[PDB]
Write a protein that binds this ligand. Structure first.
Ligand SMILES: NC(=O)c1ccc[n+]([C@@H]2O[C@H](COP(=O)([O-])OP(=O)(O)OC[C@H]3O[C@@H](n4cnc5c(N)ncnc54)[C@H](OP(=O)(O)O)[C@@H]3O)[C@@H](O)[C@H]2O)c1
Ligand SMILES: NC(=O)c1ccc[n+]([C@@H]2O[C@H](COP(=O)([O-])OP(=O)(O)OC[C@H]3O[C@@H](n4cnc5c(N)ncnc54)[C@H](OP(=O)(O)O)[C@@H]3O)[C@@H](O)[C@H]2O)c1
Ligand SMILES: COc1ccc2[nH]cc(CC(=O)O)c2c1
Ligand SMILES: COc1ccc2[nH]cc(CC(=O)O)c2c1
Ligand SMILES: COc1ccc2[nH]cc(CC(=O)O)c2c1
Ligand SMILES: COc1ccc2[nH]cc(CC(=O)O)c2c1
Lengths: 344, 344, 344, 344
């Protein structure tokens, strides 16, 4: 039996983890039990007040986020803002599996963490991107997992096959558009529907976004060159979805690149290379754990270009948390995680 | 090994049926296989060229909609425009399970079919609304099913308990808002995203809309009274969803009306009537076969109010279709049919 | 040269008064100047931090809302829609023209006010709905205006001609779909883009909505009979717009009804009657002071149907404010108000 | 009094042109008169059936697009489907001012035109982008105007000052998100409401887009060096808007770059630099002829970043046309083109 808690269940990330715990085959056959669901200000309320789409768990009472509530669980999902997984994992048994969606344990460079996040660095856990060279090995059987950010996921998948193959220059440029739900359920004026509907805006530009160094970190894991990352995230009128455009100087032929991408991904269950003439679209991956990827070559401009479409709440967080949890617990990697997206 | 065919596979209802089949527990242990996938002018093309979310069936070539093609399939789903299933049915073998998403076999009065469809009445098949009184027994083991339209499913599910209780009057009004997908994939110009985004409009008003008599028909099955229907559809900037507001004169206490809906729906797997103080929203049901329902009384205006939310492609078309296929084959009714919406 | 202040210049209604003044002919030829722009919080900040669409005023420094700062203005807009403003009005000299966007002074029945608001009734001022019978003559030269609510502008305009000609029954049904901008700038989670995008929901149903008596009041102004109102508001992924489906039982012919609406509107320059075979859509009036109206008869249901579309921040709020202000000052009524929408 | 004819009056470009003239001061006093409104297939329709938002022109009868009809007008706008306007162009009088929104007369290099347009090159007319250096001078008194593409307008105003100041390296990247209207009014199934809503997708990537050569061109006009452009457009669920993110390497301080954009843009009425700490957004410029630019520097990436927002129908097409018509006829450059957009 595997009893699972979720800290921050009243937020988007937590809702997305529960939808999938609901659909997990380990749930339907009882090898998985949904234990405690906690929050902060919303403790004492029913979950239907927050997640009216998770009707099976609507009667559940949101408990306070305390080590005393979260003890006695084999697995413990952390879907709260960064800074809390530090203290909170220090309070649980060593053998319980902790899956943190925050950024606390993502970066390996303490000085980068302080420059970008503005707090002390808690260290690093295995990185919940199984598709990354070497990462899958490190998830198998572990008990501490750090889920990647929603932007670094789309980009690394897009870029790492070419940079590891040495078919593109190590200075990359990423311009991603995201749906609103990647900002989180905290009520801020600038994420009101009246404001995002019919309006696009780029934010945190010129390399100040905290995901800039996360993409950098991962690409440096496939190369020995100096890596450079111009990241620019763009907010568009959508609830979910991440469409990441990724360019970098190349002199290799599209022949060689397309072959580079088939090798790295032909056996990946979740990565789907588009047929020629096709190009990813976010709307086709919504609600699925899949990533759609097209590669091309702008030879007039000696520019490689590669597009990834991922759902930011699944492959971008909760799907990667569940996928990492399948590996940590030794269950089939795809348990609970469909590749069939909900469309239109 | 139930071998299934889907005529009109490249349509919205066709892809939603296929999406659902791909997640059916029968497909997973092979008691179900996906067979011919047929269309009209898009025959010869691949399915991924139409449904990029259905990557497991993207390599499939869609064949023409011909008896030779459809034959030798135990179940055939027909997702064509009307005027086609009438002849396709005697052409197929009598023992195949035929399920028409269209309207050709929905209605039971020939004067009404002519008055609204301009063609000859085809007659009548069992109606795909298992929750309607007496429907389940008619579906168990039939081999011919007409699936309800999206709007009648909403209106009926919202009104009939209080009308079968004789607690409201039989002159109901329904104003249902709906996403764009119910209009289907045919490229009209007032369904272009530029004219749909940021605009709402009512169409087919004053009771010329073909769903009006279908609702009238469904409501007449639970009352001996003379029923009248004012029905108004209003298209809104959304890809999925149907919010149906239905009002009727009543002088019954709220308590008795509430009781009549709990008696009607407590044991119903896909019908979830909201806690007191919550109200349905479409986003809560999307991707899922649920209907979220709420009732209230406008004491001043002496008016009952029922609100209903259903996904227009799942519970209004393919979910009902698959739900009735489960019944016609004697499979657990909820198989492949989730009550958990994809939200936000 | 009339000085103009705007109390609550940072919210939506406030920003849309300024947009309209910015493009008002008196503002161009010096007759009109734009004085103090106050707010509760966010005072000390620039207006461009709030309305980056109003670049000309971007430098302006938002001030506190006090009788001090508001004193010394020929006209003062109280843009805290459906809030409170009675206290401010008593700290201003009676010679100052005050146009209140909120509902403090709309209602004519203290008992109804207390019942629906829980406050002491401030009393009543001329209703800013010029097309209403008798409304325009009470605005001419007035020093106190109450701008009507977004929904009752739509419903009154749709319904009163039929009602006044005694061609429909006084028990009416109105269902209105509306964009998120009517909820205001008030930060709240149920109004986040991720929430609103992709979903619809009726809220505040079955009599509880505060515009219900506002609709009753306007109708009782054109009939001596007792009027009930079933009003249902519905949220939709739009930022602006109000499409109101309004119904009442009738026995009068289509021709009698269509004539009544042309007798009432051929002179009114903001009401455009749809040609035979057309229907309102909100997309066609956005950013405009127009109301687009169509009428029909469901003969089977014995039901009148009227559809009206307006912009919820223009003809529904700021447009009514300015249109009435023009009249208050003896300026031409159409000054600065276009009937042409920015579409698609 | 200048008689004007719009050809393509039934399409998005056409109706936005007509919205502008209706608001034009030259229309209000009589120096401008709206004449024949023609379409390719819509002849015999009234204009309201196409543009319900231009109610003042609703009664106009759409005529066929033939030289006989278009003759007798001083100015003639050509909003004809993406090209094939050169025929019509030589069939009108040579003293008749024609503004072409198509692309047939934009390009300079016949070799580049054939490569991207598969057709023989018709020649080049003065580009209708006054902010481009030396461009305003060739528009004064012109009788041949080619309006820029929606995308080049953005990228050029985003990039040209820094390239002209020789501050950035002339290999530039552009990844622009855009609403659906820019694709025009032709009904594909890929522009269907259901499909663009909730989905992003890059299209025509890796240098196949016909705006890439138009971007290279304008940039070639401000520099000695050879310019290569990497242009990615991305469709988003919006109706109007373009948000162009443009990068290139730079070896300058942010200070020099801002000092170049202030130098270029302090005197141009429609180009709005953002206050330090503010970044552009599309919802702010919608319905106006404005363009909001901001520049930054990612020092660790040695990258210059310029963000530009414009309304794709106004500054991107129909506004540019009207603006260039003002210069053509010797009227003030801002006549009929506000800088204040319609938001939220
Ligand atoms: N959203 C995404 O797409 C995404 C992608 C990748 C990673 N993540 C990560 O997932 C985590 C959750 O973000 P979100 O998008 O879900 O935001 P959210 O919707 O607003 O919810 C965040 C959750 O954190 C809880 N919480 C806040 N402060 C807390 C505190 N002191 N103690 C305990 N619980 C607290 C909240 O409970 P209350 O209701 O009581 O406030 C809430 O349930 C973040 O760390 C994020 O980095 C998110
Ligand atoms: N979509 C909904 O929300 C919904 C809900 C409830 C019920 N329904 C019903 O489901 C049915 C399907 O409509 P839809 O929404 O899916 O619209 P749609 O997207 O246009 O689908 C139409 C499908 O039927 C095929 N088709 C068209 N004409 C054909 C012909 N002569 N012969 C054979 N195949 C033909 C088309 O193939 P080609 O590509 O070759 O043209 C296409 O695959 C309708 O009758 C509808 O009333 C729909
Ligand atoms: C707060 O602005 C937003 C809006 C949408 C978003 N989608 C994904 C993110 C990641 C992040 O910046 O945290 C994000 C941020
Ligand atoms: C015609 O535009 C629309 C928009 C949304 C819709 N949902 C369902 C339908 C068709 C119908 O079932 O009548 C429909 C049509
Ligand atoms: C969710 O709350 C909303 C949403 C949209 C709206 N449009 C107009 C209003 C006024 C009101 O309902 O009080 C409104 C309120
Ligand atoms: C072709 O699909 C699209 C979708 C959205 C668009 N917005 C602007 C354009 C102009 C262009 O690319 O020609 C466009 C095209």
């Amino acid at each position: 039996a595997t009893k699972v808690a979720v800290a921050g269940a009243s937020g988007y990330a937590g809702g997305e983890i529960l939808r999938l715990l609901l659909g997990h085959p380990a749930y339907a056959d009882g090898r998985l039990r949904i234990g405690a669901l906690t929050a902060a200000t919303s403790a004492g309320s029913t979950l239907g007040e927050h997640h009216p789409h998770l009707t099976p768990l609507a009667h559940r009472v949101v408990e306070p986020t305390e080590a005393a509530v979260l003890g006695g669980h084999d697995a413990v999902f952390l879907a709260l803002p960064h800074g809390h997984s530090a203290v909170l994992a220090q309070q649980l048994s060593p053998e319980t599996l902790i899956i943190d969606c925050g950024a606390d344990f993502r970066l390996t460079d303490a000085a980068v963490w302080e420059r970008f996040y503005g707090s002390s660095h808690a260290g690093s856990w295995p990185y919940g991107l199984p598709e990354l060279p070497g990462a899958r090995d490190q998830l198998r059987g572990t008990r501490r997992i750090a889920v990647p950010g929603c932007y670094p996921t789309a980009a690394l998948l897009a870029l790492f096959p070419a940079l590891a193959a040495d078919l593109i220059e190590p200075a990359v440029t990423v311009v991603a558009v995201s749906g609103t739900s990647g900002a989180g359920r905290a009520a801020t004026t600038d994420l009101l529907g009246a404001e995002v509907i019919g309006s696009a805006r780029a934010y945190n530009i010129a390399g100040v976004h905290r995901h800039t160094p996360e993409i950098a970190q991962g690409l440096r894991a496939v190369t020995d060159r100096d890596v450079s990352v111009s990241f620019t995230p763009v907010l568009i009128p959508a609830s979910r979805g991440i469409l990441a455009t990724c360019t970098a100087r190349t002199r290799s032929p599209l022949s060689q690149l397309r072959a580079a991408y088939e090798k790295a991904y032909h056996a990946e269950p979740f990565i789907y290379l588009m047929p020629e003439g096709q190009l990813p679209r976010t709307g086709a991956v919504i609600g699925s754990n899949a990533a759609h990827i097209a590669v091309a070559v702008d030879e007039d401009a000696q520019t490689f270009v590669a597009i990834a479409a991922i759902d930011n709440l699944v492959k971008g967080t909760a799907g990667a948390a569940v996928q990492s949890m399948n590996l940590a617990l030794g269950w089939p990697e795809t348990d609970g995680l469909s590749v069939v997206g909900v469309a239109p």
